[PDB]
Amino acid sequence: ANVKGCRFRVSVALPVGAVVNCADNTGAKNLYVISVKGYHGRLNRLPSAALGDMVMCSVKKGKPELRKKVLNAVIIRQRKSWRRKDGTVIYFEDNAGVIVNPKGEMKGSGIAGPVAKESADLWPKISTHAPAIV
RNA sequence: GUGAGAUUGUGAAGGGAUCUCGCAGGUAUCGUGAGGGAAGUAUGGGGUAGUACGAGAGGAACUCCCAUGCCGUGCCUCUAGUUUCUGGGGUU
Ligand SMILES: [Mg+2]
Numbered sequence: 001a002n003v004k005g006c007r008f009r010v011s012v013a014l015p016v017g018a019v020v021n022c023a024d025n026t027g028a029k030n031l032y033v034i035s036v037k038g039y040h041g042r043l044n045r046l047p048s049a050a051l052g053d054m055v056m057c058s059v060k061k062g063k064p065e066l067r068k069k070v071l072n073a074v075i076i077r078q079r080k081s082w083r084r085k086d087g088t089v090i091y092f093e094d095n096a097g098v099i100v101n102p103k104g105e106m107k108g109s110g111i112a113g114p115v116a117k118e119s120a121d122l123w124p125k126i127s128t129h130a131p132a133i134v
Numbered sequence: 135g136u137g138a139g140a141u142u143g144u145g146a147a148g149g150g151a152u153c154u155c156g157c158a159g160g161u162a163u164c165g166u167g168a169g170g171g172a173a174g175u176a177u178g179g180g181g182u183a184g185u186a187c188g189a190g191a192g193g194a195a196c197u198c199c200c201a202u203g204c205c206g207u208g209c210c211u212c213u214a215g216u217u218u219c220u221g222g223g224g225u226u
Contacts, residue, residue, distance in 0.1 A: 005178035005201045040177075040203045081213065089213045 002104075003052060003122050004038040010118060012048035013080035014095060019060060021096040023076060023112035028062030031055075031073050031097045050082065051075050051118040054104075055097065066099075073097035074104070074123055076115040076130075090134075092116075098126060 014020060018033040034056040036047035049055050057073040059066055077092040084090060092114075099107045106125040114134040120127035127133060 001178065003179080004203080006180090007201080009202070038178080038203075042204060045204095083213065087212070 002037070003054060006122055007052045007118055008085055010050035010052065011080050011082040012050045013078040014049040014055070014075065015046040016048075017046075018049070018095070020073075020075070021077075021094055021112075022059070022062065022073075022099065023096040024098040024106065024108035025110050026063070026066065026099055026108040028059040028066060028099065030059055030061035031057040031071075031099070032060045034058055034070060049075055049078075050080075051078055051116045052122045054100065057097065057099070072100045072102055074100050074119060074126060076111065076119050076126065077113065082118075092134075100125070 014033050016033055016035055020031045020033065022028040022031055033047075033049060036049045037054045037056070039047035053075055055073050055075065057071050058069065059071065075095070075097050077094055077096040079091055079093070079095055081089050081091040094113075096112070098111060098115075100123070101107060104123050104125055106129055109129060111126070111130050114132040115126060115130040116134050120130055120133045
């Protein structure tokens, strides 16, 4: 009940099972999409994520201080091409996420690469620490 | 009444009677709408508002906009997929 009807429709990229990068410097190196917040159910359909979506994750490779637990990440990059409303189709080289709180605070201090305009606008802690808002 | 046929079990040319139905519709377009089917359904955000209420802790809602999930009917401008146009090229 936080972010769903706030940004436009984006082509979903990362279903449950996906293993994305951690651009956050929380010591982790890896996420694993466990589910997606905002998934109203459809039979046989997986929870899939897009740029602005908060996911439920677990670190599969990183510090054991936060590895075997269910965390909250926010997607910032995806390889799946999404069409913006100004008619431009755009995509990243890699998928990445950044771990957050249940309320959205970034839990680290810096992002590796860029972030999108789609995920920075929903999350002001993500738009602050990002070196380039794509 | 008027046209058209048939009376095919024992040879042939004749022409009598009788039965069967044909005697008005065909073609083309625009509509009617009985009856039957039947569909859209949910959500979050904005502000209202940190207001109502309350000792405080806490903490609403409608109009009104903005989006979105599931579904439905299509579509191919874009992007993506597909190539037996074996199209052009490359290579063993
Ligand atoms: Mg009716």
